[PDB]
Design a protein around this ligand. Structure first.
Ligand SMILES: CCc1c(-c2ccccc2)c(-c2ccccc2)nn1-c1ccccc1-c1cccc(OCC(=O)O)c1
Ligand SMILES: CCc1c(-c2ccccc2)c(-c2ccccc2)nn1-c1ccccc1-c1cccc(OCC(=O)O)c1
Lengths: 135, 134
């Protein structure tokens, strides 16, 4: 019969939201932060342990980086604000992404090495090495 | 070693030279620091000759931790320092914030298996609804 505070425990996904912007205006929150807050579709995570309550928030940001056909050059607009002429190929066991802009070039190689994705980014001298687990 | 082997979700486990590589590209300090802090999943798709590479990034903050019935100082995401109390009274979790001679109450309550969230300030009401993920 009775609602207890422990029943509120779990992961809650936002499905509907009405009056957010008005309410934020009443608190005196700025336009940019009102809009950004009203956009996000956060998970709410509630934990109650007897009398101790914690509320947390989870936002996942999903971006398509690029979408291409292998061996066909295409214009990429990069997160740092370059417009590159790019082409991805498959040569000698590695996915090679080649970027050209403003007389410059940068390569980004992706390969498997012991069940892990090794990403190697080169620009002039400089290598950035990133490693990922399959999940 | 074929291209299809790269398909799937990947989680960043190690990064080195990130800042130097970004510096070479002529990227600003803000984006460099940020980018280096981020721990994305990488999602790779390749049906034949077409390839898609997307990412996902999650955060992950604590809004507040407290003990029912005991007052505490909340620092809010908008920049209020409030005197706050949380109670479970009348079938609902009532969060009451006080600052600068003002007050707002946030009520969380289950209806029809959903979490109904009602934020009230003066007489202006935000209503948000959540579905349980399990
Ligand atoms: C930092 C911004 C970024 C992301 C990204 C996205 C979200 C969170 C974190 C970082 C990516 C990306 C693209 C595709 C797949 C996975 C990551 N590229 N850049 C990027 C965008 C313009 C320029 C340079 C770089 C970049 C710089 C250093 C190392 C990189 O290594 C990519 C990898 O690890 O494969 C990529
Ligand atoms: C920064 C905006 C925010 C979020 C939030 C965070 C991320 C994305 C979207 C919105 C939250 C929050 C807290 C707890 C759980 C889920 C969301 N509170 N504020 C917030 C922070 C200062 C002031 C007011 C409000 C706020 C405004 C409207 C509705 C709210 O109702 C919370 C709920 O729906 O339970 C809460």
């Amino acid at each position: 019969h009775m609602a207890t505070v422990q029943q509120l425990e779990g992961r809650w996904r936002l499905v509907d939201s009405k009056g957010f912007d008005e309410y934020m205006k009443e608190l005196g929150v700025g336009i940019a932060l009102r809009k950004m807050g009203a956009m996000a579709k956060p998970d709410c995570i509630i934990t109650c342990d007897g009398k101790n309550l914690t509320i947390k928030t989870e936002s996942t940001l999903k971006t398509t980086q690029f979408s291409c056909t292998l061996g066909e050059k295409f214009e990429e607009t990069t997160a740092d604000g370059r417009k590159t002429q790019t082409v991805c190929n498959f040569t000698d066991g590695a996915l090679v992404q080649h970027q050209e802009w403003d007389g410059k070039e940068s390569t980004i190689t992706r390969k498997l090495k012991d069940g892990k994705l090794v990403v190697e980014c080169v620009m002039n001298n400089v290598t950035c090495t990133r490693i990922y687990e399959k999940v």
